[PDB]
UniProtKB/Swiss-Prot annotation:
Lineage: Bacteria, Bacillati, Cyanobacteriota, Cyanophyceae, Synechococcales
Superkingdom field: Bacteria
Record GO biological process: light absorption
Reported induction: Transcribed from its own promoter, it may also be cotranscribed with downstream frp.
Protein name: Orange carotenoid-binding protein
Species assigned in the record: Synechocystis sp. (strain ATCC 27184 / PCC 6803 / Kazusa)
Chief localisation class: membrane
Outcome when changing R127L: Able to convert to red form (OCP-R), no NPQ
Function, as annotated: Acts as a blue-light photoreceptor and photo-protectant. Essential for inhibiting damaged induced by excess blue-green light via a process known as non-photochemical quenching (NPQ). In the dark or dim light the stable inactive form (OCP-O) is orange, upon illumination with blue-green light it converts to a metastable active red form (OCP-R), inducing energy dissipation, quenching cellular fluorescence via NPQ. One OCP-R molecule is sufficient to quench 1 phycobilisome. More OCP-R accumulates under high-light and low temperature; in the dark OCP-R spontaneously reverts to OCP-O.
Family note: Belongs to the orange carotenoid-binding protein family.
GO cellular component: phycobilisome; plasma membrane-derived thylakoid membrane
Range of the intact protein held here: 21 to 165 of 317
Residues the record lists as binding echinenone: 15-25, 52-55, 79-89, 97-101, 123-133
Length: 137
């Protein structure tokens, strides 16, 4: 199911992908950054609208300096980066998702599948979910 889940995730639109990994992040709680630390500080320094745009840019695979930087990182550093962004959003340092937002049926189906996998399999899916975000020419 891991390759199938990765494949389906890759078909979701950017909004669904980004929403899914947010809710995946929140679920983990119920259970070092190498050269990415600076990028996190850059995002913390942006205003709320620009922070949201930055994260949307990554999921949309837009051509921006942050997206090019992101693309150069290892898979585990990309994961750690998103984890830290999640923490920062929870803490109020980075703009939160829209209030009252509901995960689409399509995204929910994928999230439900992920939650049924073994923990290692879940991380494999999430690692592959974020590895091709940002920009490659
Ligand atoms: C604007 C806007 C939105 C906004 C959406 C937004 C802003 C969404 C933001 C979503 C974010 C910030 C999601 C973060 C997810 C992080 C995960 C799952 C991390 C996993 C890490 C792992 C497994 C780490 C593992 C590891 C650790 C810890 C190590 O330390 C090393 C080991 C290892 C590698 C195994 C919406 C899309 C909702 C609506 C539309 C709309 O307009």
């Amino acid at each position: 199911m891991v390759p199938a889940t990765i494949a389906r995730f890759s078909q979701l639109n950017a909004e669904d992908q980004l929403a899914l990994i947010w809710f995946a992040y929140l679920e983990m709680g119920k259970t070092s950054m190498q050269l990415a630390e600076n990028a996190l500080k850059e995002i913390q320094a942006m205003g709320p609208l620009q922070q949201t745009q930055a994260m949307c840019d990554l999921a949309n695979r837009a051509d921006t300096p942050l997206c090019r930087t992101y693309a150069s990182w290892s898979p585990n550093i990309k994961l750690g980066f998103w984890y830290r962004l999640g923490e920062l959003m929870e803490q109020g340092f980075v703009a939160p998702i829209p209030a009252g937002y509901q995960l689409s049926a399509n995204a929910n189906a994928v999230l439900a599948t992920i939650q049924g996998l073994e923990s290692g399999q879940q991380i494999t899916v999430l690692r592959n979910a974020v590895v091709d975000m940002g920009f490659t020419a």
